[PDB]
Amino acid sequence: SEWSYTNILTGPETWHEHYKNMCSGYYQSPIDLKTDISTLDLKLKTVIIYRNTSSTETTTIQNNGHSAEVKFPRNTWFISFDGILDYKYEIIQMHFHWGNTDDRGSEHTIDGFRFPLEGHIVSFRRQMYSSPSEAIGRPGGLAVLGIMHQIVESIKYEQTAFKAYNNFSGVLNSQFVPPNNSTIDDINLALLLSLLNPSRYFRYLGSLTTPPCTENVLWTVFIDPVLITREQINLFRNLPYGSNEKQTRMGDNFRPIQLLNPIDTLASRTLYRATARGG
Amino acid sequence: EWSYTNILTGPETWHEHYKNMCSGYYQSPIDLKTDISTLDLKLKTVIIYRNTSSTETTTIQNNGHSAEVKFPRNTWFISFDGILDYKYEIIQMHFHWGNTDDRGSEHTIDGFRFPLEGHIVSFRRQMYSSPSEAIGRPGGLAVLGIMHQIVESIKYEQTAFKAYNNFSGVLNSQFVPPNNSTIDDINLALLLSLLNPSRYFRYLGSLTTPPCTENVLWTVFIDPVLITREQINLFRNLPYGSNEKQTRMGDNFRPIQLLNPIDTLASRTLYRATARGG
C-alpha cells in the first residue's frame, strides 16, 4: 500500500529509502544463485514437507494486491531439514512471483537465468517461536523454500505443479480482486516437492523480498524446476494489480537482484549448495 | 534379424522369430498406471555412484537400432539400499526416441509418451561376476528408465546434455552404423540429480529388444529430465541400419505390452515408490 512493483514513486528502487530497516541492508534477497561461486556442503540433507493428518481447517488464497498468496491454517503443514518429523518449521503461506512474459518472473536467478514463475513457501521456526507473528519480526524466525517453475508444451495435467495446487480450485480470474480471499481445496505440498529433486538446492541467509525486507530468512532454492503449461501461467496474469500499482494486470511482481556481499558488508555471507548422498 | 520399421522383421513379428522370450508374459515396456499400481513405502531412493579410481575410457556406438554408450567395467554403480558396496554395476546406456516430439519413449505414464527415454543398464554383480554371465541368466539385470521432456527456455547447464557432455558431438549425420567413438565420461550422478530419484515405478519385466529376456528389474522415474528441440533433433540425424525401411533413426521404440497378458501363469504387480514424507 506504501510500496509497489510498478509505480516509480513507490517501486523497488525506493524501498531502501522508504524502509531502511531493513531494505537498505547487505544480507538482502533475491540474489543470483551462482553454481561456480557457491560452496557444496554435503551435510545439508534432503528437505521433507509433511502434513498433520488430523488437521481439519480450510485453506484460502488472497489477491493481496502484490501477489497471489495462499494462507495455510495453523498446525497443518511442516518442513523438516533434519530427517526428524518433530514440527521445527511450520508452513504459514505460499506466494507467487511471475512475469508479463514467459522469459521472466522469478526473484532468484540461477546462473543469470530467470524462470517464468517462482513460488515461495514461507515457514516460521516453531522450534524457537510459538507463533508466526512472534517469528516474522525476530532474528532467525523464518525459512522460505523457493520453487522454480518452467513451461512445457507437452504434459498431462496430473504431472504439472497445478495438480499439486488443485488448480487453486479454479479461483484465479479477472474478478479475483484485491484484497479478496477465497476458500480453496488444500494444496498437496508433498506432491509438489516430489515433482523436483528435494536434495538439490542452494542455501543462504537472506531476507524477505518485499518491505520491510527483514534479514531473518533461511533460504532454500531448489535447482530443478517443477513443470507448468502456458495456459497455467496465463491464469496468474489475469489477476489485477492493486490500485497503488501503475500496470493494471498483475505481473513482473519480483524484486531486482541484490548482491551476495555489497561493499558495505561487515561480515561476508557464503552461498552454499546441496546434493544427494551419492556421486 | 530384427528391426523397428521393416514390417517383415519388426516388433509385431518378434514373438514368432524369438519366442524365447519375446513370446513371454512378463514383457516390457508397459503402460505405467499411477492409479493401478501399489505404493510400496519400503522401496528406497536410488543412488548412482562412481569408482573415483577408474580411468578407463567411455565410448558410444551407432548399433543400427539405437545410440548406445558403453561404460568401462568397475566404474559406475547403482545402489537401491543406501549401501555403496557395488551390488549393481552399470554396463551401458541407450536411447529410444520418435520421428516427432510427441512420441519416442517405450514406457508410457498414464498413457502419455515422452520424446526420449534413456535406459541405464546394469547387472547384479552381487550374484554374477560379469555382464556376459548376467545378461542371459535369471534375475541378471536391472535397468533405469529416464524420461526426457522438451522445454523452449533453459540454459544448456540445466539440460541432460550437460550430464551427457553433449556425447562429445558424435550425434550427427555422419555417425553411421556400426561406428564407435570415444567420448567424454557421462556424469550419471548429475543426470540423476536432474529428477527426483525417490519417485519411480518398479516392476519385473524384460529387455525391450530381441531376445526380450525376462530378467530385468525395471525402475522408471516419474519426473522427466529436460532437453531442447535442438538436442532431440541431434538424435534424429543418426542413420538407421540397413535392415530398417526408414532411413533416419527414429521411432525406435517397442509397442506397449500388457502387465498381465491373458495367458499369464502368475500375475505380476506394478509398484510405485515415493520419498518418506506426505
Ligand SMILES: *[C@@H]1O[C@H](CO)[C@@H](O[C@@H]2O[C@H](CO)[C@@H](O)[C@H](O)[C@H]2NC(C)=O)[C@H](O)[C@H]1NC(C)=O
Ligand atoms: C483451472 O482453473 C481455471 C480457472 O482459473 C479453469 O479455467 C476456466 O475454463 C472454463 C472454460 O472451459 C471457464 O470457466 C473459464 O473460461 C476459465 N477461466 C479462466 C479465467 O480461464 C480451468 O478449467 C481449470 N483447469 C482444470 C484442469 O481444472
Ligand SMILES: NS(=O)(=O)c1ccc(CCNC(=S)Nc2ccc(I)cc2)cc1
Ligand atoms: N517474498 S518473501 O517470500 O520473501 C516474503 C515472505 C513473507 C513476507 C511477509 C510476512 N507476513 C506474513 S507471512 N504474515 C503473517 C504471518 C502469520 C500470520 I497468523 C499472519 C500474518 C514478505 C516477503
Ligand SMILES: NS(=O)(=O)c1ccc(CCNC(=S)Nc2ccc(I)cc2)cc1
Ligand atoms: N532396451 S532395454 O534397455 O530393454 C535392453 C535391450 C537389450 C539389451 C541387451 C544388450 N546386451 C548387452 S548389455 N550386451 C553387452 C555385454 C557386455 C558388454 I562389455 C557390452 C554389451 C539391454 C537392454
Ligand SMILES: *[C@@H]1O[C@H](CO)[C@@H](O)[C@H](O)[C@H]1NC(C)=O
Ligand atoms: C494436529 O491437528 C490437531 C487438531 O487440529 C491439533 O490439535 C494438533 O496440535 C496438531 N498437531 C501439531 C500442530 O503438531
Ligand SMILES: *[C@@H]1O[C@H](CO)[C@@H](O)[C@H](O)[C@H]1NC(C)=O
Ligand atoms: C475473506 O472473505 C470473507 C467474505 O468476503 C470475509 O468476511 C473474511 O473476513 C475474509 N477472511 C480473510 C481470510 O481475510
Ligand SMILES: *[C@@H]1O[C@H](CO)[C@@H](O)[C@H](O)[C@H]1NC(C)=O
Ligand atoms: C575401481 O577401479 C580400480 C582401478 O581401476 C579397480 O582396481 C577396482 O577394482 C575398482 N573397484 C571396484 C570395481 O569396486
Ligand SMILES: *[C@@H]1O[C@H](CO)[C@@H](O)[C@H](O)[C@H]1NC(C)=O
Ligand atoms: C555442448 O553444446 C553446446 C554447443 O552448441 C555448448 O554451449 C556447450 O558448451 C557444449 N559443451 C561441451 C562440453 O562441449
Ligand SMILES: [Zn+2]
Ligand atoms: Zn515471495
Ligand SMILES: [Zn+2]
Ligand atoms: Zn532400451
